[PDB]
Amino acid sequence: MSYGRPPPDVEGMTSLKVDNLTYRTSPDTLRRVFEKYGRVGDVYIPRDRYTKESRGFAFVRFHDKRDAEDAMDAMDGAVLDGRELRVQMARYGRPPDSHHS
RNA sequence: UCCAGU
Numbered sequence: 001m002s003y004g005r006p007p008p009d010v011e012g013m014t015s016l017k018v019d020n021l022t023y024r025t026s027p028d029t030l031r032r033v034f035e036k037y038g039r040v041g042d043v044y045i046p047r048d049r050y051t052k053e054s055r056g057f058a059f060v061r062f063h064d065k066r067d068a069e070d071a072m073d074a075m076d077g078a079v080l081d082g083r084e085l086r087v088q089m090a091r092y093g094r095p096p097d098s099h100h101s
Numbered sequence: 102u103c104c105a106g107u
Binding site: 001002003004005006015017019020021042043044045046047048049050054056057058059061086090091092093094095097098099100 | 102103104105106107
């Protein structure tokens with residue numbers, strides 16, 4: 001499909017995430033926009049998996065605390081084009097059933 | 102608006 005699967009390092013990943021962007025932003029943008037902070041070790045857009053069109057948000061991520069702390073110290077509260085940005089540490093490894101089994 | 106993907 002797209003992107004690349006999470007690394008085999010979830011046993012110590014910093015798991016920072018990023019959201020709140022616009023319905024007009026795109027993942028190639030956030031990939032490069034956040035790559036400068038050190039390591040955009042992952043990025044995703046779980047918009048849907050049956051209609052793939054919500055695109056109202058994204059999930060940029062980091063795996064090292066030094067680049068993750070800067071990423072939120074400089075993107076939390078920013079403005080893409082007229083709304084706010086959000087970035088903070090995750091709370092789960094991944095959703096348990098958003099795609100059923 | 103916490104991932105459903107190499």
